[PDB]
Amino acid sequence: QNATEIRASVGKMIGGIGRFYIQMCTELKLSDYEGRLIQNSLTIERMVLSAFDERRNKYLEEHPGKDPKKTGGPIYRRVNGKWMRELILYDKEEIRRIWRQANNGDDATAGLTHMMIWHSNLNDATYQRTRALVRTGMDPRMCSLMQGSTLPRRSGAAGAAVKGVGTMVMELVRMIKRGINDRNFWRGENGRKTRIAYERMCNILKGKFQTAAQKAMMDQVRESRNPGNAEFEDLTFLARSALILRGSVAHKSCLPACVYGPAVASGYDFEREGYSLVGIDPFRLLQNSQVYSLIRPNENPAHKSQLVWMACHSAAFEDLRVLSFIKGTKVLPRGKLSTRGVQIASNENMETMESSTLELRSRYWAIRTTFSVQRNLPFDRTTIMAAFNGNTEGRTSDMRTEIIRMMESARPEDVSFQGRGVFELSDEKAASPIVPSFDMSNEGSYFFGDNAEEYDN
Numbered sequence: 231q232n233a234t235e236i237r238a239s240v241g242k243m244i245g246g247i248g249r250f251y252i253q254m255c256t257e258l259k260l261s262d263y264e265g266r267l268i269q270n271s272l273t274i275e276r277m278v279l280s281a282f283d284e285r286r287n288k289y290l291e292e293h294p295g296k297d298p299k300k301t302g303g304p305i306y307r308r309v310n311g312k313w314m315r316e317l318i319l320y321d322k323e324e325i326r327r328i329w330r331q332a333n334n335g336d337d338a339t340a341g342l343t344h345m346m347i348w349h350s351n352l353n354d355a356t357y358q359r360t361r362a363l364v365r366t367g368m369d370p371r372m373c374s375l376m377q378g379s380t381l382p383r384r385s386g387a388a389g390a391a392v393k394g395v396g397t398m399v400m401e402l403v404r405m406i407k408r409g410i411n412d413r414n415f416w417r418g419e420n421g422r423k424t425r426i427a428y429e430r431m432c433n434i435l436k437g438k439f440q441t442a443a444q445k446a447m448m449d450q451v452r453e454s455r456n457p458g459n460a461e462f463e464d465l466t467f468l469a470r471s472a473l474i475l476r477g478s479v480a481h482k483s484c485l486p487a488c489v490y491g492p493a494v495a496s497g498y499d500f501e502r503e504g505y506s507l508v509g510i511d512p513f514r515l516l517q518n519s520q521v522y523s524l525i526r527p528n529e530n531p532a533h534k535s536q537l538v539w540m541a542c543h544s545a546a547f548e549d550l551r552v553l554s555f556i557k558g559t560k561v562l563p564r565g566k567l568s569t570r571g572v573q574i575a576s577n578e579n580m581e582t583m584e585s586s587t588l589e590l591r592s593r594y595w596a597i598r599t600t601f602s603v604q605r606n607l608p609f610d611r612t613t614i615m616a617a618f619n620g621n622t623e624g625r626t627s628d629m630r631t632e633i634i635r636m637m638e639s640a641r642p643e644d645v646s647f648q649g650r651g652v653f654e655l656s657d658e659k660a661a662s663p664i665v666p667s668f669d670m671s672n673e674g675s676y677f678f679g680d681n682a683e684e685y686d687n
């Protein structure tokens with residue numbers, strides 16, 4: 231009745247990204263293979279984010295030097311059965327024109343934030359944030375709550391939804407620490423700018439807490455005259471609790487522009503048909519898509535396929551035992567994958583590069599959430615140790631005790647799988663659910679035994 235209009239307005243955003251991609255592939259003379267190459271997709275997506283960014287670190291993060299009226303990056307072409315790389319400079323003004331023209335005159339800011347969230351999801355599936363966490367005095371075992379930690383510095387409410395409790399705590403703790411070392415960080419006009427940002431992040435984090443006590447604790451943090459060690463400890467205590475008492479963090483399955491493009495190219499009317507990020511739409515679209523990736527001489531194609539599959543599905547922070555059943559193949563922790571990131575650095579030799587057909591399909595599909603068969607997944611060892619770390623006698627409170635009690639009663643109950651079950655892709659209505667069978671021999675976390683590169687660029 232109303233949800234019909236939300237699907238159409240979402241489909242219109244998807245449609246405009248695809249119209250944009252086709253126009254860029256055409257402008258760049260990219261072949262069908264080249265346009266489906268995910269490295270080409272990333273550069274094109276970064277160029278449009280860059281054109282509207284105006285060096286504000288709102289849509290993307292970049293390094294200053296070069297012409298501010300131009301923008302660009304690597305475009306990969308196939309010449310004589312071999313891969314080559316060129317750095318192109320495209321006028322920012324013309325990129326904006328092509329974007330708005332593809333979005334039938336609209337600025338379509340939502341289209342940009344959807345590409346930005348796809349970039350954040352790829353980084354959450356690729357890079358480790360352990361050193362970043364230890365640099366802020368946080369426990370490196372908070373890794374499972376770092377949703378959207380690579381989002382641009384001044385990204386708005388668009389990124390707020392996809393940020394984790396650990397990301398919110400990291401950003402809030404970084405502010406509290408700056409003011410502890412330097413009390414002048416809260417004085418003057420810069421202080422006024424920062425206090426407004428402090429209170430907004432506190433309310434954004436508070437919104438993710440699903441209990442009265444967790445939220446009431448965030449009230450004390452937001453309304454503290456001069457944030458310090460007391461607020462640092464309350465924030466890390468709350469991050470420890472969010473390991474047992476799960477917050478409400480949105481995981482949006484945003485796909486690359488090289489997926490939406492061919493769908494619009496072959497006549498899909500996303501505005502008319504509608505599009506929902508939740509449910510079968512991303513799954514069904516990934517079954518009717520073909521994406522290529524540049525592969526390094528030492529990489530396993532199945533492992534590069536899993537990294538991109540997990541990034542498309544905003545699933546780096548999901549239980550691998552669940553992911554494995556839905557995908558119909560074992561999803562390995564990052565430490566067990568023989569692959570690096572999708573992006574190719576300029577110091578890399580292109581003569582060694584090859585290409586691979588990414589296997590982005592799934593056996594089943596599922597929705598992100600009368601009588602159920604109680605199917606539980608034990609909490610990961612590292613998350614139990616991290617959650618029950620801090621001392622009860624250290625800093626006392628009434629809200630602290632109630633959260634401790636809530637954690638102590640949730641722990642034996644373990645992690646309950648939510649939903650009717652998984653569904654066949656042919657079952658588009660979701661009427662025949664399948665009984666999920668989980669393997670407890672495999673670990674639950676994607677970050678267990680993690681050997682990934684640290685995010686820096």
Ligand SMILES: CC1(C)COC[C@@H](COc2ccc(-c3cc(C(N)=O)c(=O)[nH]c3C(F)(F)F)cc2)O1
Nearest residue numbers: 483507508509512543545552556596597598647648
């Ligand atoms: C902690 C517990 C055990 C609690 O019970 C639920 C369970 C996770 O269950 C899921 C997780 C993810 C999806 C999912 C959904 C979408 C979507 N668009 O709806 C997608 O694109 N990709 C996926 C993905 F598999 F790939 F991750 C569906 C169901 O975790």
